[PDB]
Amino acid sequence: VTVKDVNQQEFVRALAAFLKKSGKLKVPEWVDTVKLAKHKELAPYDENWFYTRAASTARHLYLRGGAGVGSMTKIYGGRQRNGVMPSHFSRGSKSVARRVLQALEGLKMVEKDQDWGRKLTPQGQRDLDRIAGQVAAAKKK
Amino acid sequence: PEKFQHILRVLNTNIDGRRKIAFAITAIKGVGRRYAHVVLRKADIDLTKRAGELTEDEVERVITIMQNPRQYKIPDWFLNRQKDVKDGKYSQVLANGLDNKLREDLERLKKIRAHRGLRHFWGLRVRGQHTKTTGRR
Amino acid sequence: VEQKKKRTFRKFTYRGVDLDQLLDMSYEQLMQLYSARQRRRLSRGLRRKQHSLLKRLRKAKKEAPPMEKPEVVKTHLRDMIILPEMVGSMVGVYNGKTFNQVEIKPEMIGHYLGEFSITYKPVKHGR
Amino acid sequence: QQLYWSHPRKFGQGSRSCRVCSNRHGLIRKYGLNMCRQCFRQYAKDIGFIKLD
Amino acid sequence: RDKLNNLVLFDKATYDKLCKEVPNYKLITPAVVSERLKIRGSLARAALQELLSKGLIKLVSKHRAQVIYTRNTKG
Amino acid sequence: TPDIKLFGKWSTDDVQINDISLQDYIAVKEKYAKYLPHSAGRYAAKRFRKAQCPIVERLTNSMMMHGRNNGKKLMTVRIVKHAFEIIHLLTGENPLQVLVNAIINSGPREDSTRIGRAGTVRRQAVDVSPLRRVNQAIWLLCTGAREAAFRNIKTIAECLADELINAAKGSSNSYAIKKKDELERVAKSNR
RNA sequence: AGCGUGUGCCUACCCUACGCCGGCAGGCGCGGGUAACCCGUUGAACCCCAUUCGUGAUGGGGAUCGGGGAUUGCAAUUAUUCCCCAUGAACGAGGAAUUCCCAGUAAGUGCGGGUCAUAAGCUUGCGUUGAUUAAGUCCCUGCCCUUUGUACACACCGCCCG
């Protein structure tokens, strides 16, 4: 495995947990309260979820040259039920993603990229690749 | 596993116990779903279960948070009554007390004789809507 | 409206703030609190311009005897926001054809003049 | 001089017309042409808008 | 009709019913457990994941949407 | 895959349309085994061509019905794949054989047409073509499964299996079987 | 993913990536772009999926109303609109009737353009996912083909008896 080698769900699942063990990520004190998207029906069932998003994003950046919060809000953004009106896109929160981006920096997984947008760092690139291997290794099944 | 309660009361409403807590709570006037969901998360409960389950302990703990939400990392924007006016509150009205304040507010602008008030009094509409074709039955 | 009890006795606090306190600031410090729509209107209104009106209010507040109501002050500014400076006055509030006359109680605060002069007429189905 | 005589004209239907005919209704504002539809129908050949499908 | 009311917490005796029955059925999903007992559906679920323990029941597909379980692994 | 072209994982070979005449608008694969009940499929242009279409897919298509469900083939393919698995657990066999059987058993042999008849319009017993027999059967079973599934906890894959199995050996438990017998009974009178 | 779109404009003004603050709504600082250069490998949405729910108008549904946050505008009160909470309706499949339709077609599903300061439940295309079903005929309906009848010819929605 390149991270590209591992399936997205298991990769994210494994990394997100690894982050949880590490114990040092950092977390707008909120996270108990927050929905994550105006579109959103209820907050996240796994109140633990902050880690999962972080993993998801780290993987998301590693794939691509550089990304920023607006893109993430939309990615997270689902369809919002206008009620009487037909449903439409609504890019998902900007505080969570930003905080995610800021926090990741602390670990050095990602760093400000040139010309705007955060890019993965070689430190992160190394870190993701390492867990990617661990996941591949676990088993067949 | 275990059993008990079916049928528990919190502050002046009867709450079906069979039901899931978050949903179970939402009988209480002023506890909508986004509410009750966040209250419970604050109140430390295994989210995974039925209102009929849980302890007398956890219950007071839900109520205590429910009527002092601000004091528990619940933001004001999550709240029913921001900006009171009469006291410049923030607040989150609950239970029998929502019907109450609803009455107050309607009275207020009926005293003052404002057109909205008048509308409520005749039992028409107060947002800008056309009244020619609908709300007829 | 000056002394122990005399007149006073209707109270009303606006936003935790008291009418004693209300009646003493600047409209500045009032809109600061909470109201948000009314405050933006006055800021943007601004430059502001119901100037003469506000002087017409104080004027007739003066000439009014010493006990009661008095004469009133007319206007077409439906979009005006009631602020403590106004309270106790009497406003002729136009609706299209009529000027409805309304004393502004302290409760109204933050509301728009238009909300107290109904334009339309209830209506009719049977009759 | 007559300070009296105008209220905002910056925006809305009232801020524009037909360069051809004054009409403030059914106005083609795309590509900066600013012709009312009725006129645009009559002038679309001289402007260079031709029927193909 | 069809009004369904469900026992939403374990009653001992209903715990016994579960392990001493379900080996009977060839097909078991949420619905089976619900109809044949009077299980919540929510507490059906938890009984399925538990049953798959080291199984009374055996997985043949738990498509997100659906578990589909068979009888235990007998003769 | 290279040895024999099985189904999701099921063999086409050795399934025999146990019913002369029907033979052949039920399309298994007198060579045509594929992999998935989904295809670009252009059946519509010609009147016949539909027969070419694999019966499995034909069944899957009928599955995605009701305005909301239109165009959800992925959903149907998913349901079909599950149903075959449930059917297999229930009787071994080839569930595809089970499917074929239900189809063979359900097509109304005889039917009725609303012949003008003067007044008190009577109905004329007529025999029914094999294309119709196939077309009608697949409806019946799908409408059967869909109708059952709707207010019950049970899933379409399951209800489909139940409709398919009961029909494969005509249990008459099935909605479809009862419907077919009703249509046929009507055909016989009238005459 | 695709049709399309933009400022430097007949007279006031653009599309906006990216940092920060805010739960949101949004606020704020930048910097490019007369564009096949930039917004935008339009990283859309259905969908697919690992969970929860469990057949309860319930978590289906989002009406109505209350309070509150913000955006457009000089001015929004008769809600322009948006959000946040709360209040959480009818509706559990639709009689008489009746529209439209043959292959990327019906249907689901998002997007962009027009309106536009602000405002989409609209219209007007576009791609995406994509069937069932006649494969014909003149029965009903509508219109034109002969032959034929007609006291009709403002033409059957026409011209008749006490």
Short mmCIF file of all heavy atoms in Angstrom, two decimals, chain E residues 27 30-31 34 60-61 63 66 68 70, chain F residues 78 82 85-86 89 153-155 157-158:
data_model
loop_
_atom_site.label_atom_id
_atom_site.label_comp_id
_atom_site.label_asym_id
_atom_site.label_seq_id
_atom_site.Cartn_x
_atom_site.Cartn_y
_atom_site.Cartn_z
N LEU E 27 -34.48 -19.41 8.41
CA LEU E 27 -34.39 -17.97 8.14
C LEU E 27 -34.64 -17.21 9.42
O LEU E 27 -35.59 -17.50 10.15
CB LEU E 27 -35.40 -17.56 7.06
CG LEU E 27 -34.94 -17.72 5.61
CD1 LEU E 27 -34.76 -19.19 5.27
CD2 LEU E 27 -35.93 -17.07 4.66
N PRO E 30 -34.37 -9.40 11.08
CA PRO E 30 -35.03 -8.59 12.09
C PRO E 30 -36.50 -9.04 12.20
O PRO E 30 -36.97 -9.41 13.29
CB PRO E 30 -34.95 -7.17 11.53
CG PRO E 30 -34.91 -7.33 10.06
CD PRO E 30 -34.98 -8.81 9.82
N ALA E 31 -37.19 -9.07 11.07
CA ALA E 31 -38.62 -9.32 11.07
C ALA E 31 -39.02 -10.62 11.76
O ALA E 31 -40.00 -10.65 12.51
CB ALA E 31 -39.15 -9.32 9.64
N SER E 34 -38.91 -10.38 15.35
CA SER E 34 -40.02 -9.51 15.76
C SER E 34 -41.36 -10.24 15.79
O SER E 34 -42.03 -10.28 16.83
CB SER E 34 -40.11 -8.30 14.83
OG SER E 34 -40.44 -8.69 13.51
N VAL E 60 -24.89 -15.09 5.96
CA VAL E 60 -24.67 -15.29 4.53
C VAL E 60 -24.77 -13.98 3.74
O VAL E 60 -24.19 -13.86 2.66
CB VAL E 60 -25.68 -16.29 3.95
CG1 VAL E 60 -25.52 -16.40 2.44
CG2 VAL E 60 -25.53 -17.65 4.61
N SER E 61 -25.52 -12.94 4.19
CA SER E 61 -25.14 -11.63 3.76
C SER E 61 -25.77 -10.66 4.71
O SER E 61 -26.98 -10.67 4.65
CB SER E 61 -25.53 -11.20 2.31
OG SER E 61 -26.80 -11.78 1.96
N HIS E 63 -25.98 -7.21 4.19
CA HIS E 63 -25.89 -6.09 3.30
C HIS E 63 -26.34 -4.95 4.16
O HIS E 63 -27.38 -5.02 4.83
CB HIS E 63 -26.83 -6.26 2.11
CG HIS E 63 -27.43 -4.98 1.62
ND1 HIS E 63 -27.14 -4.44 0.39
CD2 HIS E 63 -28.32 -4.13 2.21
CE1 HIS E 63 -27.81 -3.31 0.23
NE2 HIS E 63 -28.53 -3.11 1.32
N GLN E 66 -29.44 -5.45 5.10
CA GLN E 66 -29.96 -6.77 5.48
C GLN E 66 -28.93 -7.89 5.73
O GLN E 66 -28.20 -8.30 4.82
CB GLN E 66 -30.94 -7.24 4.40
CG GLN E 66 -32.18 -6.38 4.26
CD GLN E 66 -33.09 -6.83 3.14
OE1 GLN E 66 -32.63 -7.46 2.18
NE2 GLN E 66 -34.37 -6.51 3.25
N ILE E 68 -29.45 -11.38 6.49
CA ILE E 68 -29.91 -12.71 6.10
C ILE E 68 -29.15 -13.83 6.79
O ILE E 68 -28.02 -14.13 6.42
CB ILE E 68 -29.81 -12.88 4.57
CG1 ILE E 68 -30.77 -11.92 3.86
CG2 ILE E 68 -30.10 -14.32 4.17
CD1 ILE E 68 -30.54 -11.83 2.36
N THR E 70 -28.86 -17.90 8.50
CA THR E 70 -29.32 -19.29 8.42
C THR E 70 -29.19 -19.99 9.75
O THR E 70 -28.45 -19.56 10.62
CB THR E 70 -28.52 -20.05 7.34
OG1 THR E 70 -27.13 -20.02 7.65
CG2 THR E 70 -28.60 -19.32 6.01
N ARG F 78 -29.26 -5.30 -6.68
CA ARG F 78 -28.88 -5.66 -5.32
C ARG F 78 -29.93 -6.55 -4.69
O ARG F 78 -29.61 -7.50 -3.98
CB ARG F 78 -28.68 -4.40 -4.48
CG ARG F 78 -27.28 -4.25 -3.91
CD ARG F 78 -26.26 -5.01 -4.74
NE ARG F 78 -26.68 -6.38 -5.00
CZ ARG F 78 -25.98 -7.26 -5.71
NH1 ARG F 78 -24.81 -6.91 -6.22
NH2 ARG F 78 -26.44 -8.49 -5.90
N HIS F 82 -29.53 -10.70 -3.72
CA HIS F 82 -29.92 -11.18 -2.40
C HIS F 82 -31.02 -12.24 -2.46
O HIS F 82 -30.98 -13.22 -1.72
CB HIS F 82 -30.37 -10.01 -1.53
CG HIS F 82 -29.27 -9.40 -0.72
ND1 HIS F 82 -28.05 -10.02 -0.53
CD2 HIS F 82 -29.19 -8.22 -0.06
CE1 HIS F 82 -27.28 -9.25 0.22
NE2 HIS F 82 -27.94 -8.15 0.51
N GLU F 85 -29.88 -15.65 -3.31
CA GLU F 85 -29.18 -16.21 -2.17
C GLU F 85 -30.15 -16.76 -1.14
O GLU F 85 -29.92 -17.82 -0.56
CB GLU F 85 -28.27 -15.16 -1.53
CG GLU F 85 -26.80 -15.51 -1.56
CD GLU F 85 -25.91 -14.29 -1.71
OE1 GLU F 85 -26.02 -13.37 -0.88
OE2 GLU F 85 -25.10 -14.25 -2.66
N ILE F 86 -31.25 -16.03 -0.90
CA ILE F 86 -32.22 -16.50 0.05
C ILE F 86 -32.87 -17.73 -0.49
O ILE F 86 -33.08 -18.69 0.24
CB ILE F 86 -33.31 -15.53 0.40
CG1 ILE F 86 -32.78 -14.29 1.14
CG2 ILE F 86 -34.36 -16.30 1.22
CD1 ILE F 86 -33.77 -13.14 1.29
N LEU F 89 -30.73 -20.76 -0.07
CA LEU F 89 -30.63 -21.25 1.28
C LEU F 89 -31.83 -22.09 1.56
O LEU F 89 -31.74 -23.11 2.25
CB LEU F 89 -30.59 -20.11 2.31
CG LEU F 89 -29.35 -19.20 2.16
CD1 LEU F 89 -29.34 -18.10 3.24
CD2 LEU F 89 -28.05 -20.02 2.12
N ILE F 153 -42.19 -5.70 7.99
CA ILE F 153 -40.82 -5.53 8.37
C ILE F 153 -39.92 -6.14 7.33
O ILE F 153 -38.82 -5.64 7.09
CB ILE F 153 -40.49 -6.20 9.68
CG1 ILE F 153 -41.36 -5.63 10.82
CG2 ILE F 153 -38.98 -6.03 9.92
CD1 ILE F 153 -42.84 -6.02 10.73
N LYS F 154 -40.41 -7.20 6.69
CA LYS F 154 -39.66 -8.00 5.72
C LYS F 154 -39.27 -7.23 4.45
O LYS F 154 -39.98 -6.32 4.02
CB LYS F 154 -40.44 -9.26 5.35
CG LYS F 154 -39.57 -10.50 5.20
CD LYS F 154 -39.74 -11.14 3.83
CE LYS F 154 -40.82 -12.21 3.85
NZ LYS F 154 -40.86 -12.94 5.14
N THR F 155 -38.14 -7.61 3.88
CA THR F 155 -37.54 -6.88 2.79
C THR F 155 -37.96 -7.51 1.51
O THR F 155 -38.34 -8.67 1.45
CB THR F 155 -36.05 -6.89 2.82
OG1 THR F 155 -35.56 -8.21 2.62
CG2 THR F 155 -35.58 -6.36 4.18
N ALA F 157 -36.26 -8.42 -0.96
CA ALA F 157 -35.50 -9.57 -1.34
C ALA F 157 -36.16 -10.77 -0.73
O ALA F 157 -36.34 -11.78 -1.42
CB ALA F 157 -34.05 -9.51 -0.83
N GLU F 158 -36.51 -10.69 0.55
CA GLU F 158 -37.19 -11.78 1.25
C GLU F 158 -38.60 -12.10 0.72
O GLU F 158 -38.96 -13.27 0.61
CB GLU F 158 -37.26 -11.48 2.75
CG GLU F 158 -37.89 -12.59 3.57
CD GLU F 158 -37.07 -13.87 3.55
OE1 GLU F 158 -35.90 -13.83 3.11
OE2 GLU F 158 -37.59 -14.92 3.98
#
